[PDB]
């Protein structure tokens, strides 16, 4: 029965001219699409689906591609009647329908549309030959959420590891579609689908300005005190993402203050995200470096780095971002007196121990570079070990040059230029001296890259102002050397050149 | 989540 004559007639009359007799079959073929038994019989007829594929586009009465399209629907909640849509060239013409004016025509193509991205293998490929990806960008601007959502995460779905897809939505207007989105809409689904999207397009380095540009930024932050775990989730990824994009952009103020106080949560991903995403912002941000400080930015950075141990996946992106807040902008000196007053330099000088490896080693010591320009901050570093253990990485680092991503000579070049900072105190060259410092100076004034030549003599100039320091220097053969570094091009290596040759008479 | 696609696709048509 039914298979043997009704559908048969039913796609008979289905396709006929008179488009009354169309109506009159469509509407039986939707109401035999609601139950399992006679719904089966019908994706198990291709000449079935094809005249309901072929009616859904070509008929202009409105209960008609509204009876096609909620019947392709209906088959689409499972796998055969997936199938039996998809090789009946049903994709194409559901990517026609997203034009309609029809609202219960376009809510059944986007569905049918999604439950076929999502189970359906080969239609991927299908939405993008039929230009599906362009039409969805241009629904964006649509105002039902719920169709939001899912237009949203068919983008999501087609975008995701496919660069062709990718470029398409970015061509199309799509970051600032989806930018709007986040800055208007509450609802959570919405909120997260469109985060994941916006994720998908910000893993690239040119594709990423067309988010920012959009304010993309400020309507990620928006989102990232809601109740949502997963939209918050996406949208500290996405930020950190950006981040290293988008440390020019104008206007960062009011996420600054939100991510500081992110890391007081107790969500250690979120921490680390937040870690992350400051240390990118304060890169070269004299701006951005004045906000931190002034929300109490050091006492987070300092109080996360303790909460975090060994765990490098966050000491380095708190320190990184503190190495930045302590250099070149006006509260320079403040933030470098900061970290003392709130108790980081023992967790700080406790960093260059092991296990610590070489990314997080390279990034504390140009932070104690930074905090050795303080005097305040000259004796507690002195007595929390400091110069022992920055010595012993300058001689590690010397025998590899004489690593995990980290050049061996920016190390020699950040330790020797802590040591040449503390040697500003009369104390620490006394024990800068004690660990035979001085012979290994000196081999240092003979390497290729001048900031290692300048550092060198910059530490033996301000040991050479100890007399018998000075001799120690002159009996290990410094003045060869010294006097060749003389006539260099590089003023502030010549400057202390002449420095030490003066002070060995 | 798993099936949250299906409720929301059946309270939009
Ligand atoms: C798991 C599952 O099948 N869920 C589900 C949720 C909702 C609906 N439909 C409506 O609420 C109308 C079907 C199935």
């Known amino acids: 029965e039914l298979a043997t004559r009704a559908i048969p007639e039913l796609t008979k009359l289905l396709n006929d001219e008179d488009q009354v007799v169309v109506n009159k079959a469509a509407v039986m073929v939707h109401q035999l699409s609601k139950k399992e038994a006679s719904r089966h019989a019908i994706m198990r007829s291709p000449q079935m689906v094809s005249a309901i594929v072929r009616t859904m586009q070509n008929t202009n009465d409105v209960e008609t591609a509204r009876c096609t399209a909620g019947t392709l629907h209906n088959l689409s909640h499972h796998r055969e009647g997936l199938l039996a849509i998809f090789k009946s060239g049903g994709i194409p013409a559901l990517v026609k329908m997203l034009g309609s004016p029809v609202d219960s025509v376009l809510f059944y193509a986007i569905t049918t549309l999604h439950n076929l991205l999502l189970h359906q293998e080969g239609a991927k490929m299908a939405v993008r030959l039929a230009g599906g990806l362009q039409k969805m960008v241009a629904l964006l601007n649509k105002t039902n959420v719920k169709f939001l959502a899912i237009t949203t995460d068919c983008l999501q779905i087609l975008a995701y590891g496919n660069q062709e897809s990718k470029l398409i939505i970015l061509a199309s207007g799509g970051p600032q579609a989806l930018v709007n989105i986040m800055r208007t809409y509450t609802y959570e689904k919405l909120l997260w689908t469109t985060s994941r999207v916006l994720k998908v397009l910000s893993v690239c380095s040119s594709n990423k300005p067309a988010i920012v540009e959009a304010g993309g930024m400020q309507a990620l932050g928006l989102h990232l005190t809601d109740p949502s775990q997963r939209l918050v989730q996406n949208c500290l990824w996405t930020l950190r993402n950006l981040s290293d994009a988008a440390t020019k952009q104008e206007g960062m103020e009011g996420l600054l203050g939100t991510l500081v106080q992110l890391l007081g949560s107790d969500d250690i991903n979120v921490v680390t995200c937040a870690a992350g995403i400051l240390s990118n912002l304060t890169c070269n941000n004299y701006k951005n470096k004045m906000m931190v400080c002034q929300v109490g930015g050091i006492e987070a950075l300092v109080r996360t780095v303790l909460r975090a141990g060994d765990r490098e996946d966050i000491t380095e992106p708190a320190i990184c971002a503190l190495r930045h807040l302590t250099s070149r902008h006006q509260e320079a000196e403040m933030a470098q007196n900061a970290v003392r007053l709130h108790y980081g330099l023992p967790v700080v000088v406790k960093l260059l121990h092991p296990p610590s490896h070489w990314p997080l080693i390279k990034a504390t010591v140009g932070l104690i570079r930074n905090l050795a320009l303080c005097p305040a901050n000259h004796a507690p570093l002195r007595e929390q070990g400091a110069i022992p253990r920055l010595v012993q990485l300058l001689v590690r680092a010397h025998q590899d040059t004489q690593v995990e991503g980290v050049r061996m000579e920016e190390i020699v070049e950040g330790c020797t230029g802590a040591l040449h900072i503390l040697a500003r105190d009369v104390h620490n060259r006394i024990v800068i001296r004690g660990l035979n410092t001085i012979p290994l100076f000196v081999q240092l004034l003979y390497s290729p890259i001048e900031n290692i030549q300048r550092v060198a003599a910059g530490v033996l100039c301000e040991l050479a102002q100890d007399k018998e320091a000075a001799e120690a220097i002159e009996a290990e053969g410094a003045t060869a050397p010294l006097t060749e570094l003389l006539h260099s091009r590089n003023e502030g290596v010549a400057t202390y050149a002449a420095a030490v040759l003066f002070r060995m008479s | ?13």
């Open chain 2, 1 to 13: 989540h798993r099936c949250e696609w299906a409720a929301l696709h059946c309270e939009l048509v």
